[PDB]
Amino acid sequence: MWRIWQLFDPRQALVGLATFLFVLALLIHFILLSTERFNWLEGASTKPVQTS
């Protein structure tokens, strides 16, 4: 449809895809990385073993 006279659609579209993927993968790696590294240095049946 006349590419919406490139007024308000093209840019928003690219920002949607780009932001969608970026945010998604970001939250995934961020949550796993955060929880992993956190609970890691955190210590709970892994770091604080017996006595060291």
From Swiss-Prot:
A bacteriochlorophyll binds at residue 29. GO terms for biological process: photosynthesis, light reaction. The modification N-formylmethionine is found at residue 1. Keywords: Antenna complex, Bacteriochlorophyll, Cell inner membrane, Cell membrane, Chlorophyll, Chromophore, Formylation, Light-harvesting polypeptide, Magnesium, Membrane, Metal-binding, Transmembrane, Transmembrane helix. It is found in: Cell inner membrane. GO terms for molecular function: bacteriochlorophyll binding; electron transporter, transferring electrons within the cyclic electron transport pathway of photosynthesis activity; metal ion binding. Residues 1-12 are cytoplasmic. Its main location: membrane. Signal peptide: none annotated. It is a single-pass type II membrane protein. Residues 34-52 are periplasmic. The core complex is formed by different alpha and beta chains, binding bacteriochlorophyll molecules, and arranged most probably in tetrameric structures disposed around the reaction center. The non-pigmented gamma chains may constitute additional components. Antenna complexes are light-harvesting systems, which transfer the excitation energy to the reaction centers. This is Light-harvesting protein B-870 alpha chain. It comes from Rhodospirillum rubrum.
